[PDB]
Amino acid sequence: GNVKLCSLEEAQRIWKQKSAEIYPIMDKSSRTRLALIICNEEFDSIPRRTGAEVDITGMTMLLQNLGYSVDVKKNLTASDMTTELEAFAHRPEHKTSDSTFLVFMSHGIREGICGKKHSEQVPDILQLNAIFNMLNTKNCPSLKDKPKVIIIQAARGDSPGVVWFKDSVXXXXXXXXXXXXX
Amino acid sequence: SAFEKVVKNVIKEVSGSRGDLIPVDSLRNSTSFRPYCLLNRKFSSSRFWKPRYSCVNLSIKDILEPSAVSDVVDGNIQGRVMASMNVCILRVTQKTWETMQHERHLQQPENKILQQLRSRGDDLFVVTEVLQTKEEVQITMVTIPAGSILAFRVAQLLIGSKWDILLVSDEKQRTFEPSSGDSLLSDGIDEEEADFQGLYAEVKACSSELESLEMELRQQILVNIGKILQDQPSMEALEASLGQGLCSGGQVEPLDGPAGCILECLVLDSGELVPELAAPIFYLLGALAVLSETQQQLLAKALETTVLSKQLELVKHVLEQSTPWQEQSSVSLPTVLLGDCWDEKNPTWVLLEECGLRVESPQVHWEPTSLIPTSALYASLFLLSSLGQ
Amino acid sequence: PSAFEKVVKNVIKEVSGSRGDLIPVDSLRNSTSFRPYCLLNRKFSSSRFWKPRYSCVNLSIKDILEPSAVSDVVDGNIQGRVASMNVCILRVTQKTWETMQHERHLQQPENKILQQLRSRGDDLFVVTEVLQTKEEVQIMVTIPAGSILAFRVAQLLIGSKWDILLVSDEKQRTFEDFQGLYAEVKACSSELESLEMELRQQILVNIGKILQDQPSMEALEASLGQGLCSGGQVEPLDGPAGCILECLVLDSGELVPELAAPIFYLLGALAVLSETQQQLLAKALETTVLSKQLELVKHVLEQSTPWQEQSSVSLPTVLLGDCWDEKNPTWVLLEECGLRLQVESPQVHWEPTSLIPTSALYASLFLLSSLGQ
Amino acid sequence: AIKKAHIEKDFIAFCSSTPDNVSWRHPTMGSVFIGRLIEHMQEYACSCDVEEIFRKVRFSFEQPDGRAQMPTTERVTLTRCFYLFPGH
């Protein structure tokens, strides 16, 4: 809808060049795409992600326009996040789906994403390895040879992400400044 | 001064749990802290100290629409206080404040100092209660006239499209609506979005948010800090420039000497102030602004040595054992990790004595009024330690 | 615990001075007894964390010395208006105390009340400062002029010499932080060699009987206070009071071992409780339910520091609010401690004026804990 | 009869920041990463594939914007070009 569309001529001339280098698409009429949105806003001892509903609405509308059917889960702990991931991997609609999206949005550290009851005394963490391990071929064979996009909005740490250095500063002319001896 | 010594006896005799009772700082300046008179204070980047009040030398009737003030109430003879003098506490009630707030509105085209103060991010308070005298007495040379003020109580006020008073001393609210730019929020922790944990967290977060400074920018800041430590007006002008770039933003004008040599580590090539790097420097400069002269002189003369970790750990022990901060407690101290001389002339003894703290037995009998000095003395000692690893 | 008793305390709350301990007048009809130079007696305080309320001797101080005059009250100190009434705090200065002590000496043949008070080991205080009024106001309630609303006391000690303590030193006798309380009760709890199996429960059940009949508690405490400083023969009593009294002496009347003084300590710990509070506590005696309650109060006093700020306490990890707010000690005992608290966490929120009550309510729970183990 | 498939393949992760660094979110606007990704997908999905859209998102984050952050493509095991083909 609000996403610029690929015309049939454009899509067919794209499909011509790298036909085997491109994942195949199940025709829209009978295909049933799926997607998952997990988002944590309220926490026990971690501040609340004010503005998360905006992202939920936007990503839901995007995955709708992309031909996927979104299922949103909100305010889960580590175990409940894992269990909803299991349930999503067990959805029989993946058997007739050509792809899927997994969008996780919460706080986080390097080890992983934060659960609802996360705390430095009682941590609630979902590791980077865990999602890949649960959505793989051995646990979700319904998506074998199918793209699985995982979008993660979280902090991978507590650092600023930037670094500051000094950066100040051959025509034969004269110096234009005044006030030298300062 | 001697008048500061006679004032504290009177304030201690009838000290009230009604609120924080500020003793007047100078005997000649006491005429300025009258009811309805104004005080300004620069921004307090901490909850464990606040910088000293600087006097504005103005009433309050000259910021509103009509120029009148109204009256002072509560002629309350506090009886004699011993060496035989009767004093009087004079109040202004919330009733009169509300009636005057609904009566006279804000003077909208006020650009003289109010605009000059919101350009500095300063907070503003009004003397809402005072303790003055009735008799003109002589002490044995010092003579004290009638009506002279020995102590006072303040109340903040905030401005904007509306002006109002805070009788409940809320430690959080600013007086002017600052540069509410990108109201972004991290997806991490940032510790809050407590007591003594807030102080360590304050100083740690402050030192951490300037870890993104190249080792040589950091060391330039540190070495030039020790240079401008001997120039208190340079410290104040630096604090003012930083508060201008922080609470208001905009272009910050260069400074000369080591003050500008520090400032070069905060401004970009355009001329604007990096908030996430200028705010810790302002925090530290304000932390030293409340320190005593001798303390910060000896602290500067201690920079070129690694002997701050010693001082920092000792002050950490002091504030660690000084809990609770409501009771006049006592603290022991190791004289083995130092074992140099640990006398009174010892550097750490002078650092703690001008810090409001009076060999084997706990020498320091911790006083509530000695929280703000010590709380600051620790903080500074930590930030300067964090500049160089 | 009436509503009218609160306005005097509201008045005194505004200008509270760190000059000393300010006792609000206990009864407005009794205020004539809390006069300057007037005398108050209190039984011995076997603890530093609480003391029982002052009972009045109904005497000035000019009637125990050689001439009967008193002398004067000074410092007409208008405290200004406060719902708009100006009150006055009246003082007597240490100079007058010293001059009156050097002028009039001890009444050598004084055996009337001095002897009656040294026989109990009670401490004696004189009202050395006062807070009274000037205006007569009406709200239907009418409030007179000159009535006394608050006071400040100073102990005195006697013997071959008589003198005053204006600095209220809690250690000195008149006649010969949470861990400190734990240490007190630990010293208190240690002796259990004289309990076989039934003496403990006799003490407990007859306490729960005399907890519902407080004059028996008071007479028991009085007999113990007499037996402590003096010893001698103690007569038995009838009913549950005597059913307890029979449980302490093995010999005739000279019980020296430091074990009856802790029982007096505990009786004083209960003596400061409110009537209804200890009524429900008595109906709560017969159960083993102390570890929960005592540990709960311990966590409360553990997290409630500092005791100068109007602080708050939420709950130990498992609060068990499956009985909260019916009549359970945590709601009623803490509200009768002057503290308005709620069911949903943070449950415990109070003011410093509840230090002495709670500290006492805890104390009993520990001694009663040692009786039943 | 048995056949074998790769245990892990055709995955791709997109994190809002580099390791050890924070990510930023506006209370009214939302998370910067989510917004930038939604914009880049609404625009480039008609012509570009999922792999290139993420590099374009990163290039949008190239210049530090005060609260800068660099999204990372992590552990991508894609073997072909994944075009979403919007409209089909």
Swiss-Prot record, chain B:
Changing residue 184 to A: Impaired interaction and cleavage by CASP1. Highly expressed in brain endothelial cells. Changing residue 174 to A: No effect on pyroptosis. Changing residue 27 to A: Reduced homoolimerization, leading to reduced ability to induce pyroptosis. Disruption phenotype: Knockout mice are born at the expected Mendelian rate and do not exhibit any overt phenotype in normal housing conditions. The gastrointestinal tract develops normally. They are however resistant to LPS-induced lethal septic shock. Primary bone marrow-derived macrophages fail to undergo pyroptosis in response to canonical (acting via CASP1), as well as to non-canonical (acting via CASP4) inflammasome activators. CASP1-mediated IL1B release is also impaired, but not CASP1 autoprocessing, nor IL1B maturation. Reduced ability to protect against acute S.typhimurium infection in the gut. Changing residue 104 to A/S: Complete loss of homooligomerization, lipid-binding, relocalization of Gasdermin-D, N-terminal to the plasma membrane and pyroptosis, as well as loss of bactericidal activity. Partial loss of homooligomerization and pyroptosis. One of its GO terms (cellular component) is mitochondrial membrane. Residues 189-205 are annotated as: Linker helix loop. It comes from the Eukaryota. GO terms for biological process: defense response to Gram-negative bacterium; defense response to Gram-positive bacterium; innate immune response; pore complex assembly; positive regulation of inflammatory response; positive regulation of interleukin-1 beta production; protein homooligomerization; protein secretion. The keyword Transcription applies. The record marks 74-75, 187-188, 217-218 as: Cleavage. The chain crosses the membrane at residues 78-82. The modification S-(2-succinyl)cysteine is found at residues 37, 55, 88, 206, 341. Changing residue 276 to K: Impaired interaction and cleavage by CASP1. The keyword Lipoprotein applies. Pfam families: Gasdermin, Gasdermin_C. Coiled coil: none annotated. Belongs to the gasdermin family. This is Gasdermin-D. It comes from Mus musculus (Mouse). The gene is Gsdmd.
From Swiss-Prot, chain C:
Changing residue 88 to A: No effect on oligomerization. The keyword Coiled coil does not apply. One of its GO terms (molecular function) is phosphatidic acid binding. Changing residue 269 to D: Disrupts intramolecular interactions and autoinhibition, leading to spontaneous pyroptosis-inducing activity. Keywords: Cell membrane, Cytoplasm, Glycoprotein, Immunity, Inflammasome, Inflammatory response, Innate immunity, Lipid-binding, Lipoprotein, Membrane, Mitochondrion, Necrosis, Nucleus, Palmitate, Phosphoprotein, Secreted, Transcription, Transcription regulation, Transmembrane, Transmembrane beta strand. Highly expressed in brain endothelial cells. GO terms for biological process: defense response to Gram-negative bacterium; defense response to Gram-positive bacterium; innate immune response; pore complex assembly; positive regulation of inflammatory response; positive regulation of interleukin-1 beta production; protein homooligomerization; protein secretion. Changing residue 78 to D: Reduced homoolimerization, leading to reduced ability to induce pyroptosis. Changing residue 171 to A: No effect on pyroptosis. GO terms for cellular component: cytosol; extracellular space; mitochondrial membrane; NLRP3 inflammasome complex; nucleoplasm; plasma membrane. The modification S-(2-succinyl)cysteine is found at residues 38, 56, 88, 188, 323. Changing residue 265 to D: Spontaneous pyroptosis-inducing activity. Cleavage by CASP1 and CASP4/CASP11 is not strictly dependent on the consensus cleavage site on GSDMD but depends on an exosite interface on CASP1 that recognizes and binds the Gasdermin-D, C-terminal (GSDMD-CT) part. Cleavage by CASP8 takes place following inactivation of MAP3K7/TAK1 by Yersinia toxin YopJ. Changing residue 359 to R: Disrupts intramolecular interactions and autoinhibition, leading to spontaneous pyroptosis-inducing activity. The modification Phosphotyrosine is found at residue 37. The keyword Repressor does not apply. The record marks 75-76, 199-200 as: Cleavage. Changing residue 56 to A: No effect on oligomerization. Belongs to the gasdermin family. This is Gasdermin-D. It comes from Mus musculus. The lineage of its organism: Eukaryota, Metazoa, Chordata, Craniata, Vertebrata.
UniProtKB/Swiss-Prot annotation, chain D:
It comes from the Eukaryota. Heterotetramer that consists of two anti-parallel arranged heterodimers, each one formed by a 20 kDa (Caspase-1 subunit p20) and a 10 kDa (Caspase-1 subunit p10) subunit. This is Caspase-1 subunit p10. The lineage of its organism: Eukaryota, Metazoa, Chordata, Craniata, Vertebrata.
